[PDB]
Amino acid sequence: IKTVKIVVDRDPVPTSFEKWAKPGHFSRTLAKGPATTTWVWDLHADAHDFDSHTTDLEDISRKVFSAHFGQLGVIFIWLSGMYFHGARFSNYEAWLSDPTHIKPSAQVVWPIVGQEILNGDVGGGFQGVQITSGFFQLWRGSGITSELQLYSTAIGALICAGLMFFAGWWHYHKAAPKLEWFQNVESMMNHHLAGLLGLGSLAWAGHQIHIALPVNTLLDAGVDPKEIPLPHEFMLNRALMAELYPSFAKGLTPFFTFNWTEYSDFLTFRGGLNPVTGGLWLTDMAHHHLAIAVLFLVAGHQYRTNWGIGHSMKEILEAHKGPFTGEGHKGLYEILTTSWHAQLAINLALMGSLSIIVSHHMYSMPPYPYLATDYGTQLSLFTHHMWIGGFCICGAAAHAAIFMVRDYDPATNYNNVLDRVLRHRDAIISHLNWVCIFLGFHSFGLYIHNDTMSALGRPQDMFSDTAIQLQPIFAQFVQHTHALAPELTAPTAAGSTSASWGGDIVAVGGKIAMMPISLGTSDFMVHHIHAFTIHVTVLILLKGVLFARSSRLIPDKANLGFRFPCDGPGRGGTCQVSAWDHVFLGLFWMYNSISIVIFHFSWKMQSDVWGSVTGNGVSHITGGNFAQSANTINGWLRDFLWAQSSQVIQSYGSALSAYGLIFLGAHFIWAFSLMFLFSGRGYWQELIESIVWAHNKLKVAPAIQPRALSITQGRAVGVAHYLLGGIATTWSFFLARIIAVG
Amino acid sequence: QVGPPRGTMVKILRPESYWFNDYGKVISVDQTGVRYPVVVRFEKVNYAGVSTNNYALDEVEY
Amino acid sequence: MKNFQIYLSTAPVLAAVWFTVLAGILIELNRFFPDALSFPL
Amino acid sequence: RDVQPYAGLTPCKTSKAFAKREKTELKALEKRLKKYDPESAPALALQATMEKTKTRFANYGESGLLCGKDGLPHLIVDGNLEHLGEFAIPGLGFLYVAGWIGYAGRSYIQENKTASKPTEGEIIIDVPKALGLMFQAGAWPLLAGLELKNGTLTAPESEITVSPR
Amino acid sequence: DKVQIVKPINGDPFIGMLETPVTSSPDVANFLSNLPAYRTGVAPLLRGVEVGLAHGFFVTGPFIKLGPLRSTDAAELAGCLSGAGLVLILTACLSIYGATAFQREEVVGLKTLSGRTIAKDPLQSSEGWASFTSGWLVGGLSGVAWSYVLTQVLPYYS
Amino acid sequence: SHAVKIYDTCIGCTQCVRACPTDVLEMVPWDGCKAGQIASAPRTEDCVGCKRCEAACPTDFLSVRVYLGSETTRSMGLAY
Amino acid sequence: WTAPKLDPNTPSPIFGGSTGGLLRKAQVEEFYVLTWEAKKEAIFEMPTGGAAIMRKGPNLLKLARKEQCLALLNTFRSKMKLDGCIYRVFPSGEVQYLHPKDGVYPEKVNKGRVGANQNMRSIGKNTNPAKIKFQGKLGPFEV
Ligand code: CLA
Ligand code: CLA
Ligand code: CLA
Ligand code: CLA
Ligand code: CLA
Ligand code: CLA
Ligand code: CLA
Ligand code: CLA
Ligand SMILES: CC1=C(C/C=C(\C)CCC[C@H](C)CCC[C@H](C)CCCC(C)C)C(=O)c2ccccc2C1=O
Ligand code: SF4
Ligand code: SF4
């Protein structure tokens, strides 16, 4: 039972540019110098492969910690930039007065080559590139009413970025912690729950209560942002705050006497949306963050660090074992306290799932004022966080495989929960593959059969709502229970969590903030498609992880490495056997799945939720054609791809001409990726030989010998350009469409 | 002693060699009557990454 | 110091500086002599 | 200048379709302008854009461009004296510049090949020597002509590595 | 005392199988062992009979209730003729499998999990598979006809 | 099965033999090289064709070469 | 090495079972046996998947492929510095001494080995395939 304490080596590495002058210092093969042009790609590929640089885990941990400091400095630079642009290059103050009709914009282009046309008529006597990041909605929900506040926090963010870089330099060059510092996971959880999430949520609840809540209440009442009292005048002047919310006239006495019901005016459980702004009630969000803060503060006292109270996570792992799982979770504490890649796999998986949940929960329960009404930012946020989630999950698989090849020790995992998974990986993969086939056959024939029947002129034999009812009865049941939650199972809630469950469509300024979402047969089919695509991505990734060390084809695959191209053309051909290549295909399917998720989201919202109420029912964007057309591949091709592409392809001569140019360019990059994907190194190397002959003819032969990309690098470039082109095509399409239609 | 002296640059005449028609320094020549006694060292690496190999007396020129 | 200069002389940093300057000059020429479809005569 | 019609292309200056193109763009600009009050900065920016469009269209009229049925200028690249500024002169400028770039590269690669460790200097560029060779490459056409005449531009066949065939 | 359930196949941990509550449970084992395919001492023809009857009986139903003529009054007759046609196709598949599959000696024997040496299944032979195919054909056609009868007869069918 | 051929440029470095995952290659005495040993491929039937020997051969061009031919069970590397 | 070592009934390594073991190929066609002498009890990695404990003294292990047996033996030699031999076992019940096939590991030159599949020429001296046209030749390599 080691005592948790602070441990450091003083001045472990001097601060010097001698390593900057020498590329590839971190390695041994790259340190000697470039013999061939492969060396550049090798340098960049293993730039952040700290495990392959040094054997000792202490130096790796220090490198990771200071690299995290550098990333956080980069993120703070990005935030400083966004706030600074929102201050000197935006119409945030104009948008504040008319958020329903002024398009948010925080980027203005220089008028050089005729690109000034990209400065669109976004309103407010302003021109610029309309933004979809939702930053304006975030600032309004945070209570920012002036550009000076944006400038002030931007400068703060820049200072914090400098501090983050200084902290990384300090914790690598001056005060690098020892390995026993990083391995204090109990303390880590205690702090990252109570102090990062707990105290962070408490701080944000306090901000929301004292700054965002009064300012946004005045904005809701119709008060001009330039007439609202400043935030310090609300936080400090208790009479001013109590004028808006009379519970503040009682001070902290109800808080400290457990008379918390007196705070019910500014700490509510209303549920639903603000009818004026179309966002979540800010009293609800303040109460939310308060309870989250309390829950995390309590949960951060779970683990024992230096005083006997608390848990030891090793013990609670090892005590969980059973008749089917052998020794159970024994040895996993060693895995996750002596392998960075294992932790990275778990954390990336959970981060990716979380980003996905974030997208779902933000479209369905818009947390910001005038966010739902701005359809472009809502679609953009959903699609963005979906893509981030899918990428993070693919990385989680990759780092799981990396751990499995490199840091997995059979001695410390004899009969534990991991070794038994490795002992029936054949059953897992075969059942998953069977599931994957089943799912694909059924779901695709649900679309292909419909295509065939429609083409044969047999709509009564289709799987549409009219012909054959494949109703998602279970999802409709969940919708019903959630719409009736505020009456029986959530009695203190004044309303449902989202209006998507049912009843009382929410409209702000004509356009619909939120509308109950129905689920017909097209929703059934597309959701089973989603499950199919997820299950195939999981098949690929889990097969890569489980067969990372060995297989019946290659038993000695662990020593071949995590990232090797093949084992040769023998055994019939051993291409793409490495778990890295599984992440390649895994990445591909991930992309494919997300492409369907975001297409379903965009079409369903344009057809059945988004629109404008005019007193004579809803006028949706596409007119509700999803329910009757999204049961056929032809329907998606025609009524979603072909129909909604008119905005992006006819965007030339307007501010969306940039989106049209990116649409074409991303198409090109995707097709360009097909070059790297469909070809192989041998051809390109021979072409290089001919070109090198041509150069040697004129004595232009480089000292660094030209080489074709490695096979792994060729696959890497292919998947990277494919993902770039596909996603940027969808990005340009979605943004141009949703900005033009509004 | 037969073949090129040590240190001289020899033009490779083996058609299949990566350094065909290129010049390489002679490191050593084996006098025990082996088939490929001439060890030639090369500034530039082949596709396998090696900088040297063995040649016969008729596969080099100086 | 000198090593940092050597670091600057590396291929990526030098490519970035050279293309930054080149883009700058080309942009300035397209600002002061804009919209040039052909060489006038 | 007034250019003769060529290849069934009328001059852009006297082309009605060119005037229609100008008119259309200017009207679009006006429409964009109308929503902005004149005092605000977008109004002045749009007026400057309109000015820029007018002077561009005027310059294209005077520059001896031939327009088609569509109404947009068309380039004559066959070598015609009346349209040499379309391709020949910028073509000569490109050939001069590109040959400068290539000759600076060839000179640096040949000079670095004499270094003790040429491949390290290939990625860490000796900036003073590099710039010296770059500015010496101003006279690329001359030096290339010297290399061609002296036979040192092109390496002989025997020295170059080739396939066994 | 710390009982482990999942065990290797027949106690040999070097064969590609594991005995689990899905494979070696007494109820599962008794159900599967009592199915006609696993009655190796019974004549292949009669095992094929029951097989065909069960299979041809159920396989008709999808064609009845989801076929092209499901709405028409002739839905049942169409579905049963579809089922009979599928039985004929499966008979062809069985005949070709029986012709091709059993061409090797298979010198290795077979034993039970208790270690009792037992004779090979007569079904697992060319002539035995032919007899099984004939039993399949008779059983499948009888089962299809029975499904037709029951759709025309059964009181609560709709 | 595949065909594996050893050529007289072999220096007897043994790397082909050490790289073989199926024990196809072996070192035999030989007077042709300095090291005094040449590789051979007696157990050619076991050659899966993975070409690890060619990857591990330092001599230019390769002294060991694998030519993929008739595919058998062992050559296909099947556990079934 | 007067005679190849015979194959006794030696204890197998402790293993909880796996789905990666012998398939029907062991029954119909062949399977391979790896036997090695262990200096001490230790945990090794199965080539099929999972972790097993080898017993002190002789051990016997049956695997689907020669490649699996040789990979595991190479692990034992390079890490634990053990000695092992491989057998091929047919369904008829005749085993077959396989590794090293000489009593000497192939990487070490041993007297009595005869060169098989050796071409006494360089790779470029092979004739062209057009010269062996319409002949029962595998290729230029076999002439
Ligand atoms: C000027 C101050 C300074 C100096 C001289 C050094 C010097 C050194 N550091 Mg330290 N370091 C510093 C600041 C400094 N560091 C800071 C601020 C941090 C926190 C991030 C660190 C974190 C740190 C770690 C974790 C490690 C070092 C290491 C090293 C050594 C290797 C240097 C090298 O190859 O990097 C040259 C690298 C570059 C020039 C690339 C810099 C890229 C930055 C960090 C990322 C910023 C974002 C980027 C620009 C985004 C790209 C996007 C683009 C495409 C648009 C050397 C002794 C390594 C070592 O082995 O030490 C012995 C090591 O592992 N340092
Ligand atoms: C109350 C205590 C507390 C808090 C708030 C944090 C917060 C954080 N830690 Mg943790 N950590 C703690 C205690 C704490 N830690 C303890 C006790 C240990 C030792 C067991 C660690 C060990 C640890 C490791 C090994 C790593 C982190 C990382 C991180 C950062 C993750 C990025 C993120 O979520 O951005 C949230 C961003 C913000 C909250 C913005 C402000 C950022 C600053 C840095 C917050 C200040 C926190 C600091 C503890 C207080 C200043 C102390 C300083 C003056 C000495 C986050 C800033 C990772 C990281 O990114 O490294 C930098 C990482 O690799 N921590
Ligand atoms: C982290 C979040 C956060 C923060 C910072 C605050 C902060 C505040 N709240 Mg709020 N509040 C929060 C969350 C938060 N709240 C939540 C979650 C709820 C819901 C229950 C409330 C509900 C609430 C109510 C209902 C009221 C407040 C009030 C207040 C203020 C009273 C502070 C006070 O005197 O108490 C005591 C504080 C201290 C004793 C600490 C002061 C110690 C100083 C800083 C020590 C410095 C000494 C230094 C060493 C040397 C001095 C010299 C040096 C400067 C040179 C303060 C601005 C009151 C108010 O006036 O609001 C308008 C009020 O009526 N809060
Ligand atoms: C918390 C996140 C995280 C962290 C810390 C790491 C860290 C690491 N990863 Mg993991 N990974 C992640 C996320 C993460 N990755 C995700 C999300 C994926 C899925 C894509 C992967 C997939 C992955 C694979 C497949 C591999 C790694 C590898 C590695 C290691 C070396 C990385 C390196 O030096 O490359 C430096 C970075 C690069 C070379 C990338 C260059 C940029 C690419 C092309 C994308 C740029 C796209 C851009 C946004 C679009 C615009 C471009 C524009 C300029 C035109 C290092 C341990 C490698 C390894 O060996 O592990 C041990 C490895 O093989 N990772
Ligand atoms: C549209 C193109 C396409 C199609 C149809 C498939 C189909 C398939 N892929 Mg491939 N794949 C593709 C593109 C495609 N992939 C691309 C471009 C990539 C990137 C490299 C991948 C990468 C890839 C990997 C890495 C994996 C797959 C897997 C799969 C299978 C998933 C199971 C499934 O769909 O259910 C079954 C098949 C279908 C539904 C396919 C369509 C068939 C329709 C419904 C017709 C049905 C029968 C019809 C009536 C014909 C009978 C009559 C006829 C004889 C006349 C399946 C075979 C996974 C797999 O095999 O495991 C299950 C897997 O692991 N694929
Ligand atoms: C897998 C996806 C899928 C599905 C669900 C359907 C479904 C259907 N099609 Mg479509 N179709 C599809 C794909 C699909 N099709 C594709 C890809 C094509 C090619 C273009 C077609 C072309 C097509 C045509 C041309 C026609 C149909 C027709 C039909 C219907 C009757 C088919 C029939 O007689 O089945 C017979 C079914 C069976 C014999 C068995 C089905 C499987 C059983 C129920 C599985 C049960 C397993 C069980 C759960 C396991 C239990 C184990 C336990 C004992 C232990 C039905 C609605 C016909 C129609 O008009 O009807 C509307 C028609 O004319 N289809
Ligand atoms: C906006 C204008 C523009 C731009 C961006 C480009 C861009 C490019 N051109 Mg193009 N080009 C243009 C206008 C333009 N060109 C015009 C107007 C002409 C007519 C003269 C050409 C004629 C031209 C030719 C003939 C070639 C290019 C090539 C190239 C590429 C490399 C050029 C270079 O300097 O590399 C750096 C320069 C070097 C490495 C030196 C290489 C030799 C250079 C290109 C020419 C010098 C040889 C000499 C004068 C004899 C010319 C013989 C020729 C008439 C057949 C690059 C993509 C080259 C290419 O990609 O082809 C594969 C190429 O061969 N261009
Ligand atoms: C030293 C510079 C240099 C020179 C003089 C040449 C010259 C030539 N190249 Mg090569 N080439 C170079 C660099 C160079 N190349 C580089 C860096 C690449 C990698 C992108 C290539 C890739 C390449 C290919 C793929 C092909 C050629 C071909 C050709 C021939 C056609 C004309 C041409 O350049 O069009 C091609 C022009 C380009 C591809 C543009 C790249 C040239 C860049 C701009 C030069 C960069 C170096 C620059 C001068 C800075 C270094 C010096 C500085 C530090 C002082 C000609 C023999 C073609 C051939 O065989 O024709 C017979 C052909 O197929 N080249
Ligand atoms: C196109 C292609 C290549 C050939 C690509 C070559 C080797 C490299 C790509 C070109 C880069 C741009 C060369 C780097 C140029 C230098 C950095 C020079 C400076 C740039 C100046 C021109 C400005 C492969 O090697 C390959 C390998 C495996 C699978 C697929 C493929 C593949 O599709
Ligand atoms: S073949 Fe290549 S590797 Fe095997 S011995 Fe002869 S030379 Fe050394
Ligand atoms: S191919 Fe694989 S198996 Fe056949 S010899 Fe070369 S290495 Fe040994």
Ligand nearest to the CA of D90: 7
Q: Hey, is G51 helix, strand or coil?
A: strand
**Helices A711-741 and A375-406, packing angle to 10 deg:** 160
- Please indicate if the annotation marks A683 as binding a ligand: yes
Q: How far is E60 from chain G (nearest CA, A)?
A: 36
Q: Which amino acid is it at E8?
A: P
Query: What sign does the CA torsion over A285, A290, A295, A299 have?
Result: positive
Query: By residue range, what is the domain housing residue B7?
Result: 1-62
Q: Which amino acid is it at A488?
A: L
Query: By residue range, what is the domain housing residue D86?
Result: 1-165
Q: Are A285 and A378 in contact (CB under 8 A)?
A: no
User: What distances in angstroms separate CA A387 from CA A355, A392, A677, one per listed residue?
Assistant: 9, 9, 21
Using a CB-CB distance cutoff of 8 angstroms, which residues of chain F are in contact with residue A571? 48-50, 75-78
Q: With CB atoms and an 8 Å threshold, state whether B54 touches F11.
A: yes
Strand-strand pairing, A506-508 and A511-514:
antiparallel
Cβ density class D129-160: b for 16+ within 10 Å, e for less: ebeebbeebeebeebbeebeeeeebebeeeeb
Q: Are A6 and A306 in contact (CB under 8 A)?
A: no
Phi/psi for D100 (5° steps) reads -60, -50
Please give, one letter per residue, the 3-state secondary structure of A27-85.
CCHHHHCCCECHHHHHHHHCCCCHHHHCCCHHHHHHHHHHHHHHHHHHHHHHHHHHHHH
Q: Which residues line ligand 6 (CB under 6 A)?
A: A 441-442, 445-446, 448-449, 452, 461; E 59, 62-63, 66-68
Closest residue by Cα to residue D69 from D121, D28, D12, D24? D12
CA angle in degrees (0–180, nearest 5) for A497-A501-A506: 75
Q: Which amino acid is it at E1?
A: D
CB burial of residue D89 (10 Å; 0-12, 13-18, 19+): middle
Ligand nearest to the CA of A404: 4
Question: Which atom of ligand 11 is the closest one to the Cα of F41?
Answer: 5
Please give, one letter per residue, the 3-state secondary structure of A664-697.
HHHHHHHHHHHHHHHCCHHHHHHHHHHHHHHHHH
Tokens of D93: 């400028």
Gapped junctions in chain G, after residues (C–N > 2.5 Å): none
Residue A636: partners with Cβ closer than 8 Å, 6 or more residues away: A599, A603, A629, A630
Q: A210 CA to middle of ligand 7, Å?
A: 65
Q: Which residues pair with G36 in a beta bridge?
A: G59, G84
Closest residue by Cα to residue A538 from A434, A682, A393? A393
Q: Which residues pair with F51 in a beta bridge?
A: none
Q: A54 CA to middle of ligand 1, Å?
A: 16
Task: State which H helix or E strand residue A8 sits in.
Answer: strand A8-10
Q: Label residue A328 left, alpha or beta by phi (over 0 means left) and psi (-120 to 50 means alpha).
A: left
Query: What sign does the CA torsion over A97, A103, A107, A110 have?
Result: negative
Number of Cβ within 10 Å of residue G2's Cβ equals 4
Give me the residue from F4, F21, F37 closest to G67, CB to CB: F21
Cβ density class A621-658: b for 16+ within 10 Å, e for less: bbebbbbbbbbbeebbeebbeebbeebbeebeebbbbb
Question: C27 touching A, CB under 8 A?
Answer: yes
Locate the DSSP E strands across A461-539: 506-508, 511-514
User: Which residue out of B18, B47, B50 would a mutagenesis test of the A interface target, given it has the greatest number of A Cβ atoms within 10 Å?
Assistant: B47
Closest residue by Cα to residue G52 from A419, A32, D159? A419
Residue A458: partners with Cβ closer than 8 Å, 6 or more residues away: E68
Phi/psi for E128 (5° steps) reads -65, -40
Give partners of C (≥3 CB pairs < 8 A): A, D
User: Which residue out of A36, A698, A699, A704 would a mutagenesis test of the D interface target, given it has the greatest number of D Cβ atoms within 10 Å?
Assistant: A699
Number of Cβ within 10 Å of residue A152's Cβ equals 14
Tokens of A178: 């020892």
Give me the residue from F32, F59, F60 closest to B34, CB to CB: F32
Question: A21 touching C, CB under 8 A?
Answer: yes
User: What distances in angstroms separate CA D92 from CA A213, C36, D63, D81, E44, one per listed residue?
Assistant: 68, 16, 19, 14, 90
Q: Hey, is A107 helix, strand or coil?
A: strand
Q: With CB atoms and an 8 Å threshold, state whether D123 touches C6.
A: no
Number of Cβ within 10 Å of residue A159's Cβ equals 12
Q: Which residues pair with E110 in a beta bridge?
A: E118
Give how many domains chain D has, as a whole number: 1
For residue A30, the chain D residue with the least C-alpha distance is D120
Closest residue by Cα to residue A740 from A117, A107, A114, A120? A120
Distance, CA of A414 to CA of A553 (rounded, Å) = 24
Q: How far is A675 from chain F (nearest CA, A)?
A: 26
- DSSP of chain D: -----BTTBEESTT-HHHHHHHHHHHHHHHHHHHTS-TTSHHHHHHHHHHHHHHHHHHHHHHTTPEE-SSSSEE---S--GGGHHHHHHHHHHHHHHHHHHHHHHHHHHHHHTTSSSHHHHHHB--HHHHHHHHHHGGGHHHHHHHHHHHT-SS--TTTS-----
Q: Are A313 and A303 in contact (CB under 8 A)?
A: yes
Which residue, judged by its Cα, is nearest atom 1 of ligand 3? A203
Please count the residue pairs, one from chain A and one from chain E, whose beta carbons lie less than 8 angstroms apart: 15
Give how many domains chain B has, as a whole number: 1
Q: B26 CA to middle of ligand 1, Å?
A: 43
- DSSP of A385-439: HHHHHHHHHHHHHHHHHHHHHHT--TTT-SSSHHHHHHHSHHHHHHHHHHHHHHH
Q: How far is G96 from chain A (nearest CA, A)?
A: 22
Question: A569 touching F, CB under 8 A?
Answer: yes
Q: Which residues line ligand 11 (CB under 6 A)?
A: A 570; F 4, 19-22, 24-25, 47-53, 66
CB burial of residue D88 (10 Å; 0-12, 13-18, 19+): middle
Distance, CA of F47 to CA of F77 (rounded, Å) = 9
**Most distant CA atoms of chain F, gap in Å:** 44
Closest residue by Cα to residue B55 from B26, F40, D159? B26
Query: What sign does the CA torsion over A325, A326, A328, A330 have?
Result: negative
Q: Please state the length of chain E.
A: 158
Closest residue by Cα to residue A602 from A418, A330, A376? A376
CB burial of residue B36 (10 Å; 0-12, 13-18, 19+): buried
Give me the residue from E6, E16, E71 closest to A324, CB to CB: E6
Residue F22: partners with Cβ closer than 8 Å, 6 or more residues away: F43, F46, F47, F48, F74, G66, G67, G70
- Final resolution, Å: 2.9
Q: Are A448 and A504 in contact (CB under 8 A)?
A: no
Tokens of A141: 């929900």
For residue G123, the chain B residue with the least C-alpha distance is B16
Give me the residue from B32, B34, B46 closest to F60, CB to CB: B46
Distance, CA of C32 to CA of C37 (rounded, Å) = 14
Please give, one letter per residue, the 3-state secondary structure of A122-161.
CCCCCEEEECCCCHHHHHHHHCCCCHHHHHHHHHHHHHHH
Determine whether the shortest distance from the Cβ of D98 to ligand 7 is under 6 A. yes
Tokens of E87: 């039985």
Closest residue by Cα to residue E16 from G47, G91, A541? G47
Those residues of chain F whose CB sits closer than 8 Å to some CB in chain G are: 3-9, 12, 14, 17-18, 20-23, 25-30, 36-38, 40-44, 46, 48, 61-63, 65, 67, 69, 73-74, 77-80
Number of Cβ within 10 Å of residue C30's Cβ equals 14
CB burial of residue D1 (10 Å; 0-12, 13-18, 19+): exposed
